Amino acid sequence: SINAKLVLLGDVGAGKSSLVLRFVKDQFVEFQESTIGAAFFSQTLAVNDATVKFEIWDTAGQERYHSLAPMYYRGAAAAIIVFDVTNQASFERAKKWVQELQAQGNPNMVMALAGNKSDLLDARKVTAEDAQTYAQENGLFFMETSAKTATNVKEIFYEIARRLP
Amino acid sequence: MRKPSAGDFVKSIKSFIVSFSNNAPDPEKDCAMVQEFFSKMEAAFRAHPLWSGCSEEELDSAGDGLEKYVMTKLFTRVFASNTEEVIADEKLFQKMSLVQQFISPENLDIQPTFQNESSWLLAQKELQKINMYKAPRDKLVCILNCCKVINNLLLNASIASNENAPGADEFLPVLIYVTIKANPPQLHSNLLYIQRYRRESKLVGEAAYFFTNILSAESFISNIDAKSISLDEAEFEKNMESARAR
Numbered sequence A: 001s002i003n004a005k006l007v008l009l010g011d012v013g014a015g016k017s018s019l020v021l022r023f024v025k026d027q028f029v030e031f032q033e034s035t036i037g038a039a040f041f042s043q044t045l046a047v048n049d050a051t052v053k054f055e056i057w058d059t060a061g062q063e064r065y066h067s068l069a070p071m072y073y074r075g076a077a078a079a080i081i082v083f084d085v086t087n088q089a090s091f092e093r094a095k096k097w098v099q100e101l102q103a104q105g106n107p108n109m110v111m112a113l114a115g116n117k118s119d120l121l122d123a124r125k126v127t128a129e130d131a132q133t134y135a136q137e138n139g140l141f142f143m144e145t146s147a148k149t150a151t152n153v154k155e156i157f158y159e160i161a162r163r164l165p
Numbered sequence B: 001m002r003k004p005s006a007g008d009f010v011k012s013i014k015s016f017i018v019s020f021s022n023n024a025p026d027p028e029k030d031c032a033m034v035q036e037f038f039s040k041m042e043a044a045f046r047a048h049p050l051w052s053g054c055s056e057e058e059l060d061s062a063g064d065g066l067e068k069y070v071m072t073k074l075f076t077r078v079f080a081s082n083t084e085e086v087i088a089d090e091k092l093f094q095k096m097s098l099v100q101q102f103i104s105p106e107n108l109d110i111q112p113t114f115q116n117e118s119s120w121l122l123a124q125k126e127l128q129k130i131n132m133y134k135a136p137r138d139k140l141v142c143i144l145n146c147c148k149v150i151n152n153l154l155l156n157a158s159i160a161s162n163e164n165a166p167g168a169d170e171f172l173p174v175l176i177y178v179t180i181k182a183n184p185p186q187l188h189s190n191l192l193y194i195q196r197y198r199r200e201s202k203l204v205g206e207a208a209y210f211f212t213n214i215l216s217a218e219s220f221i222s223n224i225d226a227k228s229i230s231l232d233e234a235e236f237e238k239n240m241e242s243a244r245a246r
């Protein structure tokens, strides 16, 4: 009864699909086998004795499709911009999405920056500091997430639902 | 609807069709008039003292029935009905009939792990059925079937190559390929017509998501150049020439 359109932005391999499947089905490919695609989902959540229903829109992350994205994020009440903490190039890309939504998305959009694959230790290349700093400077919140271990998956969607104008 | 109780519903729908010619064709107004007529007849289905025993699904079917009847009458005045839509159609057809001859899945970032060996033939065929129907619903259903088929085929590829579930990153590039290979006639007018004339209460949810996918596919395809399908400018232009000769 609060109906939200939520877009997932970020480049291929970041973990947009893994994130939303953890959130929706509570599965990760390595533990449960694959059942359904992850491009579109409806999900309801209880927030503060109310109800918030998410329509979740995946987008193609490849460079050649970048200029298509505004058609997807048009009228989005919220966005999760995902990056892979082990890929510095994914982080750079996530900041451009933020900049773009600020030039060209809704000012009352709740953006969340998700730093995915937190569970990967010897691979990590992006600091909590930079992500956190970046998000603090640009009016959005940063969370570290993991689809595999489930860390901060439910919570990032909860925190988005909480902040809904 | 032929039953004698429905006499005055029938008169009403028909005085609408006759009263539609009374204005010079204009898409933005025309479709506004039809959506309002739909909004109003549909209000008259549920609220009607005779139709107060109907299930939600039955009232929804009657909506689609009205849509179909009305849109079939209005079809030639409202569909691809001016020069600029005709021109955009032909530009899209031209580009696809050329590009379909040399495009490969790697031009669109389709990974070998998500390859289908029919080249998603059944999804191509579902899409090409689009000009077999006149109602926006049945046109949209072709798009939606195409999408479902693509998704089931992608899921199969992921199972086989032990990959994670497909998302927009896998789906959209495959919708683009499939659309190019299908080259469905009057794709631009077909989409505009669905957008305008489909019962607006129904262009929502998953339906609207996959619709937005095909609209973004149309847009990508219109704008295909060497750089957008990752080919050298000389390789691209030379591929286009050989396509024209066939």
Ligand SMILES: Nc1nc2c(ncn2[C@@H]2O[C@H](COP(=O)(O)OP(N)(=O)O)[C@@H](O)[C@H]2O)c(=O)[nH]1
Pocket: A010, A011, A012, A013, A014, A015, A016, A017, A018, A019, A029, A061, A116, A117, A118, A119, A120, A145, A146, A147, A148, A149, B164, B165, B167, B169
């Ligand atoms: N270790 C780890 N791997 C992940 C995580 N999230 C996604 N992955 C993996 O990284 C790959 C890309 O994920 P995917 O969700 O397909 O990316 P996309 N293209 O953004 O949807 C997949 O193999 C997936 O299993 C995570 O939190 N931890």
